[PDB]
Structure 1
Amino acid sequence: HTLVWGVWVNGVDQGDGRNIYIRSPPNNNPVKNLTSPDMTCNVDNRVVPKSVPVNAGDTLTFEWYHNTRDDDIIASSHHGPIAVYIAPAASNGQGNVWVKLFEDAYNVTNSTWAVDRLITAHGQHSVVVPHVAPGDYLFRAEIIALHEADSLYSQNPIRGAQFYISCAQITINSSDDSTPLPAGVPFPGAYTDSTPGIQFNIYTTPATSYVAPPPSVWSGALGGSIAQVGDASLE
């Protein structure tokens, strides 16, 4: 159970974005139905009044929280991967539009899931803004909590992989467009009951064997991190 509070751009806090530049849902409950319209941008997908200005190459940091800013972030039980996708904003997230910019699942070197490291990072993970066409975009940050994912939601709706999905409205101003954004995958649609990484038993299957759901990270993606960029406590 987690939400995005706001974003940072090059280590500068853009301020509380909830219902302003984040298409915030009404609460921190997960989406679990893989065929739900709620898989696009969570349960209240609508245009919000602001879009955060960035340039290509900026570090864009998402900041998550549980109940209040800079708290425990997400229950430690919620082990799983983190991904970020981008789509042009005029799509409203509909159609074959989502391109993956970032994936982090289980780090064998550290012996930790992405969610475990997100807690240590005070809720913060970042991407480099890609060199796509200037214009308005949706950045879809997705945490998948796997503590109940041994079942399919379609078999037992009390269980299933849990999707914490947050869409930020981002405007890319300066970009040379050296990596034009291709068509991508649909949400809902990209994840199905048979997709690798959706049904996974963390109690019985080693995390060293986990394969995160496709699609693979786009060749145009410039990277990211799970690390505290900004100190919310200094404000």
Structure 2
Amino acid sequence: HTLVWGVWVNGVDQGDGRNIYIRSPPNNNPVKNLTSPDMTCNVDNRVVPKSVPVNAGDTLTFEWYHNTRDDDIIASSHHGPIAVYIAPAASNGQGNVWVKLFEDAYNVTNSTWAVDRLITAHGQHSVVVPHVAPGDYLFRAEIIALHEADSLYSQNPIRGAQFYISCAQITINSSDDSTPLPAGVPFPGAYTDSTPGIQFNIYTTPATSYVAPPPSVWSGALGGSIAQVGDASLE
């Protein structure tokens, strides 16, 4: 159970984005239904009044929280991977539009899941803004908590992989469009019951064996990291 507070650009806090430049849902409940329109940008997908200006090569940092800013972030039980996607705003995230800019699942050296390192990072994870066409974009940040992912929601609706999905409205101003955006996957649609990484038993299967859901990260990406860029407590 987690939500996005706002973003940072190049290490500079852009301010509370909830219902402003983040298409925020009303609470931190997960999405579980892989076929639901809620997979696109969570349960209150509508245009919000602001879009954060960035340029290609900027660092865009999402900042998550549980109940209040810079708290425990997400329950430690919610082991799983983190991904970020991009699509043009004109799509409203419909169709074959979502391109992956970032993936982190399990780090064998540190023996930590992406979620574990998100907590250590005070909720902060980043991508580098790609050289796509200037214009309006949706950046879709996705945490998958696997603690009840031994079951499929479609079979048992009180269990399943949990998706914490947040869409940020981002305007890319300066870009040479040297890496124009390639075809995307649909959400809902890309994840199915047979997709690698959707049904997994983190209690019995070694984390080293985990494979995150495709698609692969676009070669045009520059992303990106799970790491604290800014100290929220100084404000």
Instruction: Give the TM interval when normalised to the shorter protein.
Output: over 0.9
**d(CA) in 1 for partners of 2:83, 2:228:** 17
Distance in 2 separating the partners of 1:202 and 1:148: 9
Cα distance in 1 for partners of 2:33, 2:120 equals 29
Separation in 2, partners of 1:213, 1:170: 25
In 2: Cα distance, 1:227 partner to 1:202 partner: 24
TM-score (norm 2): 1.00
* Offset of residue 53 of structure 1: 0.1
Structure 1 residues 106-153: Cα deviation after superposition (integer angstroms, max 9, x where no partner): 001110000000000000000000000000000000000000000000
| Alpha-carbon distance, 1:155 to partner | 1.0
**Percentage identity across paired residues of the two chains:** 100
Structure-2 separation of matches of 1:17 and 1:126: 16
Shift of 1:182: 1.1
> Secondary structure of 2:233's match?
helix
Taking the aligned partners of 1:77 and 1:22, their CA distance within structure 2 comes to 26
- Cα deviation for residue 87 of structure 1 reads 0.1
Q: Which digits, 9 at most, give the CA deviation of each residue in 1:39-79, with x for residues without a partner?
A: 00000000000000000000000000000000000000000
Q: Could you say which residue in structure 2 is the equivalent of 1:168? A: 168
Partner of 2:189: 189
Deviation by residue 1:70-101 (Cα, 9 ceiling, x = unmatched): 00000000000000000000000000000000
> For residues 204 and 88 of structure 1, what CA distance do their matches in structure 2 show?
40
| TM-score between both structures, scaled by the size of structure 1 | 1.00
Structure 2 residue runs without a partner (length 5+): none
RMSD: 0.4
Q: How many pairs align?
A: 235
- Paired residue secondary structure (2:44): coil
In the alignment, what sits opposite 2:144? 144
Gaps in structure 1 of 5+ consecutive residues:
none
Give the distance between the partners of 1:115 and 1:144, measured in 2 at CA: 9
Q: CA deviation at 1:183?
A: 1.4
Please tell me whether residue 114 in structure 1 is matched to residue 122 in structure 2. no
SS in 1 for 2:41: coil
Q: Deviations over 1:159-194 (max 9, x none)?
A: 000000000000000001110001100000000000
Q: CA deviation at 1:223?
A: 2.1
Which whole-Å CA distance do the structure 2 matches of 1:223 and 1:75 have between them? 25
**Superimposed CA distance per residue, residues 168-225 of structure 1 (whole angstroms, 9 cap, x where no aligned partner):** 0000000011100011000000000000000000011110000000000001001201
